[PDB]
Structure formats: C-alpha cells, structure tokens
C-alpha cells in the first residue's frame, strides 16, 4: 500500500527526519527517525522503514542518498511524500501502557500523540486490561481520565474504543433513539448489520446500562412495519449457518418474495420480514440470486419499487448486509466523507466497531470500488490526532 504523507518543517532548517539508505544499497531511501514534533504535525502515517517513492510529485524511486537530501533541503516548509513500507501488541505490558498513558495525560497540554499510538494499536481486550491497570495506579477510571483530557472527535473515537463491543453498540443504539426524533440511519445500520451473538450481548448490556430493554426503546421510537422489522431483527434469533444447503427452501423463499412483492398489488410485508429475518445469511444470499430467476428486478430494485420511507431504508440496508457486509460498510464510509464536511458520527462508529471484525475486507472492497484507499479518503476529510486515530484503525493503505 502506497501511503501519502505531508510533512512540515518544525525547525528553521529541518523537517525532523533522519533519512537512511538510498540507491547505493539498491533500495529506495528510507525514513529511520521521526521527531516527536513531526509525528504530531504530519498528515498521514509515516513509519520507520517507509521507502520514499515520490516527493512533491517527482519520482525519487531511483535516486541516490544525496539526491533526495538536496531535494528536501531545497523544498519549502510543507512537503508531500508518497511512501510504502519496505517488506494487538507482541510484548503487551498493560502496566507499562497504563503508565505511559498517565504520563501522556499529565503532560502539560496533553500528549494526544502517545494516547492515540497506544490505544488505537491495542485490541479491545488489551484496552480492558490497560484500563484495569490504570484504575489501580491512579484511582481514576481510564475512560474518565481520557474524557477530561480530550475533546472534539478524538474524544469520541478514544471513548468508543474503550467500551466493549456490546457496550459501544448499546450506547450508540441509545443515542440513536434519545431525544424527540430518531436517527433512523444509525438505528438501521446497527440493527441490520449485527449477528445473533452480537445482538444477544447488546440486548443484555443495554438492560444493565440503561435499566430498560432495547426492544421497549425501539417500540417507543418507531412504528408501523418499520417497527416490526427492527423489533424482529433485534431479537437476534436468525437461523445459524447450516451445513446442508436447503435448495428446495431456497427456491420457495425466492418465489414467496416475488409473490409477496413485485407480482401482486401492494406488498405482503410480514412475508418479506419473516423470510429476511429468519433464514441464515448464506441461505438468503442464494435466495436473492434465485429471486432473479423469477423477477425482472433484483432484490434491491424490487424493494425501491415496493416500499418507501424508513421501511424501504431498512430493507435496503438489510439486503446489502446480507449480500456483502464489507462492501456495505465501504459504501457507508464513502458516503460519510464524499461530500461537504464529514458525517463523523458514522465514520467514527464504523472505524471503531469494524476495526477488529472485517476491516481488511472493508478496505479491499473500498479500494476496488472507489479506486483510492480508505486511508486516502480519511486523510482528505479529517486532520490532527483525530485523523491519526482513524488511520490506525484503518490499518494501512490499500
């Protein structure tokens, strides 16, 4: 993966980089040291071991060591590099992580660089261990200390990362329904994309956190067939992936979806809800292909023709999640950034919640469809330590 990095001069006469090697050793020049100031101000992710492929649009792939030195010394204050690495934690010490996080928090002005470098490069399980060690050493909960030390969207990312997956989803669900309206897009995204085991844990933790059940909150915030679909999905009782492929049921479900929708006036919505909530995901993938044998429109086209509003939005999201969940998230990521500004709520939630699930597939679907990497879009839309946290959650270019 070719990453793009923008460095800025920190001292008069210096970017803060120790360059290494060159075409003398038949390799491209390589970064060997980055000043802490450069690490804080650069845009992107620059690692020790990145080969420098281009500089301000000039290909320096085949340059000797002193050739790239002259280029950088005669460049301006801001320089753009194209780089590529020359091809959890391994020595995980929760106590050392907790100590370094405390030192970063207690540094005058807060050392966000260190907080991000650690937390976004530990697994959620390791973060829980760090949090336990932190409370012991400091008598403060880690999440409270960081809530006070951080602000803006960086605070949102870091606090999201510190919750268990179930706690994070439950609080995101609660936020989508709190207040006079509903954030249907977020409610749909979570309810349509979580599996049985995730929803079972969400249902349990939601009741512990909020002293009321998710289902009652959904009923109090939604109505009509939109409510029926959300309630059914949230129960998390979809059939598990079987070993036997049920070809007779595949054909019958495809016929039933057709007979309930495009073939008749109006729609038999309970029939759509039953089939699409109860059958396993691999079964429904084959149902949707068999559906095209009977229907002139595929399942997504049929939904747009049959229903509208929240119900339509939900069926469309559900079908995408069934057909190709990594591509579903790649598209939502793209939509969160493509236009003016950023839908940060969505961008953050996906990067936090999928970083340990299927981020490799998301990045692959994203680059295949959109041509540039997810890294690249995050870099154009966000800045600062917040950008850095999302890029680490991304996990590389391409």
């Amino acid at each position: 993966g070719e990453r793009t990095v923008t460095i800025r001069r920190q001292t008069v006469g210096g970017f803060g980089l120790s360059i290494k090697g060159g075409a003398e050793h038949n390799i491209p020049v390589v970064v060997s040291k980055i000043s802490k100031e450069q690490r804080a101000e650069l845009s992107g992710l620059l690692f020790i071991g990145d080969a420098i492929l281009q500089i301000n649009g000039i290909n320096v792939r085949k340059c000797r060591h002193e050739e790239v030195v002259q280029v950088l010394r005669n460049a301006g204050e801001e320089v753009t590099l194209t780089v590529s690495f020359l091809k959890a934690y391994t020595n995980f010490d929760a106590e050392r992580d907790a100590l370094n996080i405390e030192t970063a928090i207690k540094t005058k002005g807060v050392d966000e660089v260190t907080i991000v470098n650690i937390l976004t490069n530990r697994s959620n399980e390791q973060r829980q261990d760090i949090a336990f060690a932190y409370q012991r050493r400091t008598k403060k909960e880690l999440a409270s200390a960081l809530k006070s030390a951080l602000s803006g969207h960086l605070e949102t990312v870091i606090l999201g990362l510190l919750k268990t997956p179930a706690q994070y989803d439950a609080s995101e669900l609660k936020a989508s329904m709190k207040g006079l309206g509903t954030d249907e897009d977020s409610l749909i995204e979570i309810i349509c994309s979580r599996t049985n085991q995730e929803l079972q844990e969400i249902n349990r933790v939601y009741k512990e956190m909020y002293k009321t059940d998710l289902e009652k909150d959904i009923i109090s915030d939604t109505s009509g067939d939109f409510r029926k679909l959300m309630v059914a999905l949230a129960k998390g009782r979809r059939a598990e992936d079987g070993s036997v492929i049920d070809y007779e049921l595949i054909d019958q479900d495809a016929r039933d979806l057709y007979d309930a929708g495009v073939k008749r006036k109006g729609t038999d919505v309970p029939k759509w809800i039953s089939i699409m909530t109860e059958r396993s995901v691999p079964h429904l993938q084959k149902v949707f292909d068999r559906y095209k044998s009977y229907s002139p429109y595929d399942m997504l086209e049929s939904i747009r023709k049959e229903v509208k509003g929240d119900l339509e939005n939900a069926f469309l999201n559900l079908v995408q999640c069934i057909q190709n969940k990594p591509l579903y998230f790649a598209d939502r990521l793209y939509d969160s950034m493509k236009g003016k500004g950023t839908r940060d709520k969505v961008l953050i939630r996906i990067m936090v919640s999928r970083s340990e699930v299927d981020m490799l597939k998301i990045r692959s679907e994203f680059k295949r469809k959109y041509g540039k990497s997810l890294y690249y879009y995050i870099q154009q839309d966000t800045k600062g330590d917040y950008q850095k946290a999302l890029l680490y959650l991304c996990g590389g270019d391409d």
Partner: peptide
C-alpha cells in the same frame, strides 16, 4: 541483508 547504511538528518 544489507551493508552499513548512511543516515542524514533533514
């Protein structure tokens, strides 16, 4: 798998 490399601060 290589020799002693040159290092330059820029």
């Amino acid at each position: 798998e290589d020799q002693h490399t040159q290092i330059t601060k820029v």
